[PDB]
Amino acid sequence: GAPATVTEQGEDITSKKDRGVLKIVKRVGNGEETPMIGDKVYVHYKGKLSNGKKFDSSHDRNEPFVFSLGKGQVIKAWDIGVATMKKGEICHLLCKPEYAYGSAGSLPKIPSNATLFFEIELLDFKGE
Numbered sequence: 001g002a003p004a005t006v007t008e009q010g011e012d013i014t015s016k017k018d019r020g021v022l023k024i025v026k027r028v029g030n031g032e033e034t035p036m037i038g039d040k041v042y043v044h045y046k047g048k049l050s051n052g053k054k055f056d057s058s059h060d061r062n063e064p065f066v067f068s069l070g071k072g073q074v075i076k077a078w079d080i081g082v083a084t085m086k087k088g089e090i091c092h093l094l095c096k097p098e099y100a101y102g103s104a105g106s107l108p109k110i111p112s113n114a115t116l117f118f119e120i121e122l123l124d125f126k127g128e
């Protein structure tokens with residue numbers, strides 16, 4: 001399925017080239033501009049654990065998830081991955097725990113040492 005495919009066929013987008021964050025572009029977005037540090041970014045997403053369980057979805061809430069890029073308001077994989085996206089792009093990200101919740105995990109659903117799968121759509125980005 002999609003998690004296996006990004007694991008086996010994804011591109012390493014980390015600066016360290018340690019394969020901690022792998023990406024596949026599923027829908028090409030608009031133009032050539034990606035957001036910059038500090039921009040307010042609006043995304044839709046769904047996350048799955050490696051046991052197949054969905055652990056989160058903005059779609060199911062009927063509102064986007066909004067954060068300021070590059071400020072550690074989200075897991076490292078998201079700051080790195082969303083920074084590579086164009087407006088309107090949909091991607092898959094496969095996130096090793098060192099770029100996610102590490103040994104701590106995150107209650108109630110994310111265990112220790114969890115590799116996470118996300119589908120992310122970049123809806124919009126704007127400077128404040």
Ligand SMILES: COc1ccc(OCCN2CC[C@H]3CCC[C@@H](C2=O)N3S(=O)(=O)c2ccc3ncsc3c2)cc1OC
Binds near residue numbers: 065073074076100102
């Ligand atoms: C500074 O480094 C951190 C920053 C934030 C952080 O957690 C809070 C931010 N955060 C929660 C929002 C959501 C979408 C952005 C992605 C992700 C998220 O980052 N979740 S998640 O999908 O991995 C997630 C994580 C836990 C969770 N529990 C119930 S639903 C749910 C969803 C954790 C951090 O280190 C572990």
